[PDB]
Design a protein around this ligand. Structure first.
Ligand SMILES: Nc1ncnc2c1ncn2[C@@H]1O[C@H](COP(=O)(O)OP(=O)(O)OP(O)(O)=S)[C@@H](O)[C@H]1O
Ligand SMILES: [Mg+2]
Lengths: 96, 48
């Protein structure tokens, strides 16, 4: 990991490794890379809290392969939970 | 900077603020003085 991260083009290589079945959507793959790697959540002096994870919204016309990107993130991430609004065969987002 | 100011005393700690708010809520319930009433009665009718 240290050897491959020492390379200068590590970020572009990671972005290109995002979702190999998806073609030509480099900006989406970059946003997915930021969301998967994440930032640092910080609580300064206890009182003030700052969120440290990236929220990404893919707004697209249908047939633009957003779903395959979501399944790629599900296979890739450590703890990825898939939920859907229209469908029913999924874990709900509301606590019960 | 917040830690240095809390050591200085120009800002006090959040749990201590919570406990102080509880203390002041149970202990103190102020009254307005009669000399403080006519000023409110004037500064309330000038707005109207
Ligand atoms: N850039 C792309 N690269 C590879 N496959 C693509 C690309 N764009 C579309 N597809 C294919 O087009 C189809 C779209 O299917 P889905 O991604 O499941 O549907 P969708 O893109 O989420 O759009 P919806 O669900 O109707 S809003 C899949 O077979 C994808 O593989
Ligand atoms: Mg879809």
């Amino acid at each position: 990991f240290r050897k491959i991260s020492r390379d200068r083009g590590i970020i572009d290589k990671i972005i290109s490794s995002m979702a190999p079945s998806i073609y030509g959507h480099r900006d989406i793959k970059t946003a997915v890379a930021c969301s998967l790697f994440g930032g640092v959540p910080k609580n300064v002096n206890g009182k003030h809290s700052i969120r440290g994870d990236i929220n990404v919204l893919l707004l697209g016309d249908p047939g633009t392969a957003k779903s395959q990107i979501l399944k790629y993130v599900e296979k890739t991430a450590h703890r990825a939970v898939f939920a859907t609004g229209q469908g029913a065969s999924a874990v709900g987002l509301t606590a019960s | 900077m917040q830690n240095q100011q809390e050591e200085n005393g120009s800002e006090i700690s959040i749990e201590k603020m919570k406990r102080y708010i509880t203390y002041c809520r149970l202990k103190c319930a102020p009254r307005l003085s009669p000399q403080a009433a006519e000023k409110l009665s004037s500064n309330f009718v000038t707005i109207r």
